[PDB]
A paper describes a structure:
[name] ([name]; [name]) is the best studied member of the family and is prominent for its involvement in Farber disease (FD), a genetic disorder in humans. [name] is ubiquitously expressed and found in the lysosome where it normally regulates sphingolipid metabolism through intralysosomal membrane turnover. Similar to other Ntn-hydrolases, [name] is synthesized as an inactive proenzyme that requires proteolysis for activation. The α-subunit consists of a globular helical domain formed by five α-helices preceded by a 36-residue linker region, whereas the β-subunit contains two central anti-parallel β-sheets flanked on either side by a total of six α-helices.
Two structures are of the full-length proenzyme before autocleavage, from naked mole rat (nmr, 83% identity to human) and common minke whale (cmw, 85% identity). The autocleavage reaction was prevented in these structures by mutating the catalytic cysteine residue to alanine (C143A). Although the overall structures of the proenzymes from nmr-[name] and cmw-[name] are similar (root-mean-square deviation (r.m.s.d.) = 0.73 Å), there are differences. In the α-subunit, the orientations and lengths of helices, particularly helices-α2 and -α3, are slightly different. The β-subunits are essentially identical, but there is a significant deviation in the ~ 14-residue loop connecting strand-β4 to helix-α6 (L4-6). In nmr-[name], L4-6 forms an extended structure that protrudes ‘outward,’ whereas in cmw-[name] it flips toward the center of the protein and sits atop the junction between the subunits. The significance of this loop variation is unclear, because in cmw-[name] it is involved in a crystal contact. In the proenzyme structure, the peptide bond between Cys 143 (Ala 143 in the inactivated structures) and residue 142 (methionine in nmr-[name] and isoleucine in cmw-[name]) is intact as shown by continuous electron density. Since both inactive structures are of the C143A mutant, the position of the thiol was not experimentally determined, but we could model it based on energetically accessible cysteine rotamers and their corresponding steric clashes with the protein. In both inactive structures, only one rotamer satisfies these criteria (Rot1).
Numbering used by the authors: 30 to 228, 232 to 240, 252 to 395
Write the structure that this text describes.
Amino acid sequence: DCRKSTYPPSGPTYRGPVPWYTINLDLPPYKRWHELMVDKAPALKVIVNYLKNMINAFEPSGKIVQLVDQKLPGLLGSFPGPFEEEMKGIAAVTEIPLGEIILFNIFYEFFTIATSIITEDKEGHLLHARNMDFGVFLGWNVNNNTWVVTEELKPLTVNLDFQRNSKTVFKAAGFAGYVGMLTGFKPGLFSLTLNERFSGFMGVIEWIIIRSVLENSTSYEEAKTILTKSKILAPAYFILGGSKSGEGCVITRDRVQSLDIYELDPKQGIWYVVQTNYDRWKNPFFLDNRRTPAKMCLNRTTQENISFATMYDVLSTKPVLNKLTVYTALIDVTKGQFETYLRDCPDPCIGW
Ligand SMILES: *[C@@H]1O[C@H](CO[C@@H]2O[C@@H](C)[C@@H](O)[C@@H](O)[C@@H]2O)[C@@H](O[C@@H]2O[C@H](CO)[C@@H](O)[C@H](O)[C@H]2NC(C)=O)[C@H](O)[C@H]1NC(C)=O
Ligand SMILES: *[C@@H]1O[C@H](CO)[C@@H](O[C@@H]2O[C@H](CO)[C@@H](O)[C@H](O)[C@H]2NC(C)=O)[C@H](O)[C@H]1NC(C)=O
């Protein structure tokens, strides 16, 4: 049964709060991540090495960095101007080869599963919350080092305030060394989270957005048209929450088109949406064990009682909370609230 009285965070499931850093976009891209990357190269090397070994194990024929590295020069030009220089700055501070920073930035998404939730209270105001796990590759694969690596990643979790001099452009939950983001919001406009979709990974290999929307989109409408129509490297689920009552949708994407766009409709009894890493119309497999208990616990909460505290209760209930859960994030776009908490799951707790 669902957890209760878990907010404000305390106890063994609470690893601590996520530190805040300001990223000044007025600075030259090369310098933006300098302060953040201090003293983080050792941990980041552990993460990068983990990605390599998992990719090599998944495709024993070839070595991944060989291909990225040998195909690297072309990749740099493929990137928009700022990202290349931001990554070179990261490589310099950390003394990590540029190719490995790029490998980390390209493939990080494929090692994340998440539970993303949008809800609307009777007042008509949206809450956006998310539990993020790390280490599970393509939604099912792990190795005997996954748990050690995930614990090493938690100190890299950071809340980022992207600013233009002294004005906040957008806020995000991210990871030092990763210049992209899978969780962010623009105060008073919209919130956005990305869940990985597995249908894909070869496409990236064959080939070898959230930031751009957060940085330059001026409205929920604009972000929606970009997220629905723009081409993307791999399939994904976009969970987009707005400020206005009823501005909440889940976009299921493939490389080229939106396979489904599903909106909240509290008038017709749909006051929440729970998106994990499988298509919501399909039936869940044995491995998809997170969405149903979340829906079960939201149903018991009722729209009347939905809040930060009751939302945190849902995201503190196993298996929604699990051993590989890195952080819990709570967002209220209208009021500008953005809370992120590191998590633990003491035994007995399932991996994911
Ligand atoms: C994860 O496993 C690797 C591989 O080691 C083998 O598998 C283990 C389950 C165990 O049975 C080992 O005895 C096996 O040899 C571990 O890598 C080894 O680490 C130590 C160094 O401290 C040593 O045994 C070897 O140098 C390593 N072997 C290889 C092939 O690299 C690794 O330590 C395991 N991780 C954890 C967290 O235990
Ligand atoms: C968000 O928009 C700003 C301006 O709208 C972008 O800044 C430009 O980025 C281009 C490439 O996208 C660079 O070549 C230019 O140097 C930048 N121009 C200015 C005037 O700063 C910004 O790049 C966009 N978002 C991201 C993530 O790059």
